[PDB]
Amino acid sequence: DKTFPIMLNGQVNGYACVVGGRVFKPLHVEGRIDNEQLAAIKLKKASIYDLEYGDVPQCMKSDTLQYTSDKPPGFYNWHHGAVQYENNRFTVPRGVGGKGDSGRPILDNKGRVVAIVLGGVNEGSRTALSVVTWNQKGVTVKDTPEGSEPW
Amino acid sequence: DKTFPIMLNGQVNGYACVVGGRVFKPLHVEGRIDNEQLAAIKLKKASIYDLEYGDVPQCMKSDTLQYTSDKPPGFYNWHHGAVQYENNRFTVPRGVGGKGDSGRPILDNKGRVVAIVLGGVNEGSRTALSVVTWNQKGVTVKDTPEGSEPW
Amino acid sequence: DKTFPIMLNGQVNGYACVVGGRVFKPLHVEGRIDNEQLAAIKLKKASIYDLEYGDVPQCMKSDTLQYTSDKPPGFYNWHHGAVQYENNRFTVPRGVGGKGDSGRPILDNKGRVVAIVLGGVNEGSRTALSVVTWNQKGVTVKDTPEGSEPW
Amino acid sequence: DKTFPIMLNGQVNGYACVVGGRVFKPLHVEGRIDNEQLAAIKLKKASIYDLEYGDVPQCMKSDTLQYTSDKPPGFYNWHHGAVQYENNRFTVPRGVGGKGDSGRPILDNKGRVVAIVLGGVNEGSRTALSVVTWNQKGVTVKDTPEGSEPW
Amino acid sequence: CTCVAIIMVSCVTSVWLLCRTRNLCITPYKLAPNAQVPILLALLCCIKPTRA
């Protein structure tokens, strides 16, 4: 796919994902995006929605498209497995979800991104995911389980 | 031939050929040479010919000889076609000559560089292209046709 | 072995060796190491004993072990051949001993680095290498033969 | 042919060629000649043309006939290869161009000397030779490239 | 005013002589952590303690 990671001191500590028009990068990680095209874009601050300026050039726009509401419970593919829930993400078993997994998009069966993983390293028996979500009518919210350490 | 192309925001915008005596780079197009050995060449402005100063070391110079004046009106191998004229420029099949791919040298059957293209995007059914040339005794003259367009 | 070279203007003019815990680099060469993790290290200048800083994190330490005391004068390993002297360095043939070959380690039969070359371009039919080593009790010494230009 | 090495302290350091009418010897080298009958040749200094006095008698005259002007750019009988240019020397490859072999002549296809080399140790990827030529009517010309160390 | 300049100059000269000795106290032993250190050159003349 198209997901360029962020490297600080030569080590991958976070992942930056591009959605339609705008690039999204978690601001609790530090470093520099390795793409020389991406590094010429300014960065503006927000809440823990983790916004970055979408000043991408014309030749690359509309790579991955977001998913709106009417989201089923279903089964959604994930980069290290699968997640099957709607209100939150699936509490994946242990071992999955180490360090440096922030900013990974969660996609649908049609390639539509429905979430971006931010926190929730350990949640007891199975690790829940602290992601950003589009709500029942197209507004972005942020869902956090209690006691979720950031990545 | 070994002609390094210019780079601007990832995509190409022109070709900077290397001729013995002085490397050629159009100042009508922009960008920076990605080669580290040619990045140390001092960028000196020139006249309306859109020329870059040839500060290349002499060992990797004169690998590409250049044709002199008094050219025949016979065949000349363009990179995507063939030109057969002496004073003016012969017609090229339509479609070639878009945007951001100028500076490609026009060679001969002996491989010597005859001319360096700068313009000629679209000029009707008979495709004429604005070029620099050597007129009679080695004088470097730019010839632009009527209704010319930069490339 | 892992030995990252040093780049300056596209050519290689030196080599940087890594021992257990610490990173070595000759003072006579100028340039940037190709490892971006090693560029963030605060290397400090020192005397002829060539003290640098091993500020690398835990994940890749102890690449190779430096050779201890009780040094025999028998066979030893080398990148361009073999050396067979303990008090001095062996009269290696030509080919090795040109320019930009500094910083290459000299290993033992168990893969233990004994010395790092610094000079001794050519001394006639017999070429002597100016290296650093430990004399008797692990104290770092520097042995330099007569007429040892920086190599 | 007939060329004489110059004896200096037991090793060869230069070649003293003989042309019909006047013998030659490089000024930048020194030593003793290797012929008993050339010991009576009066040694003298001169300008940058490398001018010596060929006062040899008639007993060994007319060894190598000289060549006139209008030299073609074709093949030439260099002692370690060939030269295929007229105004400049041909870019001889690596290996050739060592040290201590000055004064070596360049032969024609008719067995005529056309030039005497003087220097050009190494320039980098290719090698240029500082050689003597005859311009238009037989006037002796010393031609040098940029940065030519004597050789 | 001439007196206090002499004490200030001589203090920063001797302490840079002592810092150069301090830098050369440890430099023959930092390049080899596996080599043992004497107890005379650790606490009396130099400063460093036993580590690792």
Q: Which contiguous run of DSSP H or E holds residue D15?
A: strand D11-19
Neighbours of B (≥3 Cβ pairs closer than 8 A)?
A, C, D
Q: Does B57 touch chain D (CB under 8 A)?
A: yes
- C-beta of residue C146 within 8 angstroms of C-beta of residue E35: no
Of C117, C105, C7, C6, nearest to C63 by C-alpha is C105
Residue that has been written with the tokens 């290498």 in this structure: C129
- Number of other residues whose CB lies within 10 A of the CB of residue B3: 17
Sheet strands side by side (includes D11-19): D3-8, D11-19, D22-23
Of A111, A150, A115, nearest to A133 by C-alpha is A115
Using alpha carbons, list the distances in angstroms from residue D112 to B148, C133, D109: 56, 60, 7
* Residue E34 backbone dihedrals phi, psi, to 5 degrees: -75, -20
3-class DSSP state of D140: strand
3-class DSSP state of A39: helix
Q: How far apart are CA A8 and CA D64, in angstroms?
A: 72
Of D1, D142, D139, nearest to D65 by C-alpha is D1
* Bridge partners (DSSP) listed for residue C140: C134
Please, which residues have CB within 8 angstroms of residue D58's CB and are 6 or more apart in sequence? Answer: none
Of C92, C115, C116, nearest to C15 by C-alpha is C116
Give the closest-approach CA distance of D88 to chain B in angstroms.
11
Q: Is the dihedral of CA C96, C102, C104, C106 positive or negative?
A: positive
Task: Find the catalytic residue in D28, D55, D69, D80.
Answer: D28
Please, which residues have CB within 8 angstroms of residue A80's CB and are 6 or more apart in sequence? Answer: A92, A96, A97, A101
**Structure-token pair, residue B10:** 């990832």
- Number of other residues whose CB lies within 10 A of the CB of residue E18: 11
Of C47, C50, C68, Cβ closest to residue E34: C68
DSSP string, A48-84: TT-B------TTT---S-B--S---S--EEETTEEE-
- C-beta of residue E31 within 8 angstroms of C-beta of residue C140: yes
Q: Is the dihedral of CA C72, C76, C82, C86 positive or negative?
A: negative
- Number of other residues whose CB lies within 10 A of the CB of residue D83: 22
Q: Quick check: do C and B touch, 3+ CB pairs under 8 A?
A: yes
* CB-based burial, C22-60: b 16+ in 10 Å, e otherwise: bbbbbbebebebebebbeebebeebeeebbbebebeeee
Please judge whether C46 and E36 are an interchain contact, meaning their C-beta atoms are less than 8 angstroms apart. no
**Structure-token pair, residue A140:** 């972005």
Of A2, A23, A6, nearest to A14 by C-alpha is A6
Please judge whether E24 and C47 are an interchain contact, meaning their C-beta atoms are less than 8 angstroms apart. yes
DSSP string, D78-98: ETTEE---SSS---B-SSS--
* Neighboring chain B residues of A57 at a CB cutoff of 8 Å: 9-10
What is the torsion angle, in degrees rounded to the nearest 10, for the CA atoms of residue D8, residue D14, residue D15 and residue D19? -110
3-class DSSP state of E19: helix
DSSP string, chain B: ---EEEEETTEEEEEE-EETTEE---SSS--EE--TTTTTS-----STT--------GGGSSSS-B--SS--SS-EEETTEEE--SSS-----TT---SS---PEEE-TT--EEEEE-B-S--SSS----EEEE-SSS-EEEE--TT--B-
Please judge whether B59 and D146 are an interchain contact, meaning their C-beta atoms are less than 8 angstroms apart. no
Q: How far apart are CA D79 and CA B65, in angstroms?
A: 27
Of C22, C142, C3, nearest to E31 by C-alpha is C22
Q: How far apart are CA C18 and CA A42, in angstroms?
A: 38
Q: How far apart are CA E34 and CA E44, in angstroms?
A: 22
To one decimal place, what's the resolution in Å?
A: 3.4
- Number of other residues whose CB lies within 10 A of the CB of residue B84: 12
**Structure-token pair, residue C69:** 């005391």
Q: How far apart are CA D103 and CA C16, in angstroms?
A: 44
Q: How far apart are CA E46 and CA E26, in angstroms?
A: 8
Q: Where would I find the beta strands (DSSP E) of C34-81? A: 76-77
Give the closest-approach CA distance of C7 to chain B in angstroms.
11
* Residue A48 backbone dihedrals phi, psi, to 5 degrees: -85, 10
* Bridge partners (DSSP) listed for residue B106: B115
Q: Does B11 touch chain A (CB under 8 A)?
A: yes
Using alpha carbons, list the distances in angstroms from residue D142 to A122, D48, D90, D145: 83, 8, 16, 10
Q: Is the dihedral of CA D92, D95, D100, D106 positive or negative?
A: negative
**Structure-token pair, residue E44:** 């009396």
Please judge whether C35 and A9 are an interchain contact, meaning their C-beta atoms are less than 8 angstroms apart. no
Q: How far apart are CA C29 and CA C44, in angstroms?
A: 14
Q: Quick check: do B and E touch, 3+ CB pairs under 8 A?
A: no
Clarify whether D102 is annotated catalytic: yes
Using alpha carbons, list the distances in angstroms from residue A134 to A85, A105, B92, D25, D35: 14, 13, 54, 90, 99
Please judge whether E27 and C46 are an interchain contact, meaning their C-beta atoms are less than 8 angstroms apart. yes
Q: How far apart are CA C74 and CA C68, in angstroms?
A: 15
Amino acid at C24: F
- Number of other residues whose CB lies within 10 A of the CB of residue D149: 11
* Neighboring chain C residues of A9 at a CB cutoff of 8 Å: 36-37, 40
Please judge whether C36 and A11 are an interchain contact, meaning their C-beta atoms are less than 8 angstroms apart. no
Structure obtained using: cryo-EM
The DSSP symbol for E41 reads H
* Bridge partners (DSSP) listed for residue C38: none
Q: How far apart are CA B120 and CA B65, in angstroms?
A: 25
D120: left (phi over 0), alpha (psi -120 to 50) or beta: left
Which of B7, B9, B13 is the mutation pick for testing A, counting most A CBs within 10 A?
Answer: B9
3-class DSSP state of C5: strand
Q: How many CB pairs under 8 A join B and D?
A: 11
3-class DSSP state of E30: helix
Give the closest-approach CA distance of B8 to chain A in angstroms.
10
Q: Does C41 touch chain A (CB under 8 A)?
A: no
Please judge whether A37 and B10 are an interchain contact, meaning their C-beta atoms are less than 8 angstroms apart. yes
Residue that has been written with the tokens 């705008």 in this structure: A22
Task: Find the catalytic residue in D101, D102, D130, D148.
Answer: D102
DSSP string, B118-132: -B-S--SSS----EE
- Residues 116-145 in D contacting B (C-alpha not used; CB under 8 Å): 123-126, 128, 145
Q: How far apart are CA C17 and CA B81, in angstroms?
A: 53
Amino acid at C30: E
Q: Does C11 touch chain B (CB under 8 A)?
A: no
Count the alpha carbons within 13 Å of D34 in the hemisphere toward its beta carbon. 18
Task: Find the catalytic residue in C1, C47, C62, C102.
Answer: C102
* Residue D60 backbone dihedrals phi, psi, to 5 degrees: -125, 45
Amino acid at C49: Y
Please, which residues have CB within 8 angstroms of residue B98's CB and are 6 or more apart in sequence? Answer: B121
Using alpha carbons, list the distances in angstroms from residue C97 to D93, D126, E1: 21, 22, 60
- C-beta of residue E8 within 8 angstroms of C-beta of residue E14: no
**Structure-token pair, residue D85:** 């240019």
Please, which residues have CB within 8 angstroms of residue B19's CB and are 6 or more apart in sequence? Answer: B64, B66, B105, B113
Task: Find the catalytic residue in C1, C50, C108, C125.
Answer: C50
Q: Which contiguous run of DSSP H or E holds residue E5?
A: helix E2-30
Please name the residue of chain B whose CA is at the shortest distance from the CA of residue D93: B59
Q: Does D86 touch chain B (CB under 8 A)?
A: no
Rounded to 5, what percent of chain D is helix, strand, coil? 0, 30, 70
Q: Which contiguous run of DSSP H or E holds residue E3?
A: helix E2-30
3-class DSSP state of E7: helix
**Structure-token pair, residue D105:** 């002549």
- C-beta of residue B103 within 8 angstroms of C-beta of residue B8: no
**Gaps in chain A after residue (C–N beyond 2.5 Å):** none
E6: left (phi over 0), alpha (psi -120 to 50) or beta: alpha
**Structure-token pair, residue D69:** 């002007």
* Neighboring chain C residues of E31 at a CB cutoff of 8 Å: 22, 49-51, 140
- In angstroms and rounded to an integer, the radius of gyration of the C-alpha atoms of chain A is 15
Q: How far apart are CA C130 and CA C149, in angstroms?
A: 9
Residue that has been written with the tokens 């003349």 in this structure: E45
**Structure-token pair, residue B119:** 């313009």
Please name the residue of chain D whose CA is at the shortest distance from the CA of residue B61: D126
- C-beta of residue B67 within 8 angstroms of C-beta of residue B48: no
* Neighboring chain C residues of A11 at a CB cutoff of 8 Å: 37
Of E23, E24, E32, Cβ closest to residue C66: E32
Neighbours of D (≥3 Cβ pairs closer than 8 A)?
B
Please name the residue of chain B whose CA is at the shortest distance from the CA of residue D90: B62
Q: Does C10 touch chain B (CB under 8 A)?
A: yes
3-class DSSP state of D20: coil
* Bridge partners (DSSP) listed for residue D4: D16
* Bridge partners (DSSP) listed for residue D8: D11
Q: Which contiguous run of DSSP H or E holds residue E2?
A: helix E2-30
Centroid of chain to Cα A95: 19
Which of B37, B58, B61, B62 is the mutation pick for testing D, counting most D CBs within 10 A?
Answer: B58
* Residue D115 backbone dihedrals phi, psi, to 5 degrees: -160, 160
**Structure-token pair, residue B115:** 């001319």
- C-beta of residue A104 within 8 angstroms of C-beta of residue A114: no
Q: How far apart are CA B143 and CA B69, in angstroms?
A: 14
